[PDB]
Amino acid sequence: METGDQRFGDLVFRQLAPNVWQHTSYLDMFGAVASNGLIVRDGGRVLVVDTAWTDDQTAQILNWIKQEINLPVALAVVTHAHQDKMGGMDALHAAGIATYANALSNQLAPQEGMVAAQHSLTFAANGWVEPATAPNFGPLKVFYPGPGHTSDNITVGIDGTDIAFGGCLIKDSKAKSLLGDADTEHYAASARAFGAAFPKASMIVMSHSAPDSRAAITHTARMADKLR
Numbered sequence: 001m002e003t004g005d006q007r008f009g010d011l012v013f014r015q016l017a018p019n020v021w022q023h024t025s026y027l028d029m030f031g032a033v034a035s036n037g038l039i040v041r042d043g044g045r046v047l048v049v050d051t052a053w054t055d056d057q058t059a060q061i062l063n064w065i066k067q068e069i070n071l072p073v074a075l076a077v078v079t080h081a082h083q084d085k086m087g088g089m090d091a092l093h094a095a096g097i098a099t100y101a102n103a104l105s106n107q108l109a110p111q112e113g114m115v116a117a118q119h120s121l122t123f124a125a126n127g128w129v130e131p132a133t134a135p136n137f138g139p140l141k142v143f144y145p146g147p148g149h150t151s152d153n154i155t156v157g158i159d160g161t162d163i164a165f166g167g168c169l170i171k172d173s174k175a176k177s178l179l180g181d182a183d184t185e186h187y188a189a190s191a192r193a194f195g196a197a198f199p200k201a202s203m204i205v206m207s208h209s210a211p212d213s214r215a216a217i218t219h220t221a222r223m224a225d226k227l228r
């Protein structure tokens, strides 16, 4: 917890820019483990990146949005099929929110014990989302960097800001380690591809660290170089 953070139930919210917030939820494992996602205000609507670990926690994200922003949530995008990112899908579907994930994330979801998203994103060979599969994503710029943390992991830049979201692919520059589902061969190149896709992002948001500078990307890639 840090100055300027807002506690709402057992969740924490931090404003990162005029129209961007980080949501943080916690699961006991080892102690409490944090997972971060994003909330974006885009005109008269709100966009969400990643659920919380659980449905009840994700419901509280929606309650916080109602109180602090009071705009309808148009869509949510989730960045791979693990519990921290997709554990709360039912809360979104119960609320009528359109949900999006990598097609591979939706294909893996049943095996991972997750509820698949309603819609599937596909990607070009250069990693950029096929625009037809990302309808009305507004400032959310979705990029598939290649296999790393998982084979399905995706990343999201926030257009009009200096923020890019690396999900669980990127760790901060103080991390000592990065891998059960991981592609250790391609991880380093995937980390570097994320950096090259969002070359002007100066605030890197990630799932299990507080926001960091671009050094988080390079430090992560150099740690991943050692896995090969």
Ligand SMILES: SC[C@H]1SC[C@@H]2Nc3ccccc3N21
Pocket (backbone or CB within 6 Å): 029, 033, 082, 083, 084, 168, 208
């Ligand atoms: S990246 C998916 C999440 S869900 C359970 C597993 N173990 C773990 C431990 C610490 C941080 C994150 C994690 N992961």
Ligand SMILES: [Zn+2]
Pocket (backbone or CB within 6 Å): 080, 082, 149, 150, 168
């Ligand atoms: Zn994961």
Ligand SMILES: [Zn+2]
Pocket (backbone or CB within 6 Å): 035, 082, 084, 168, 207, 208
């Ligand atoms: Zn994670």
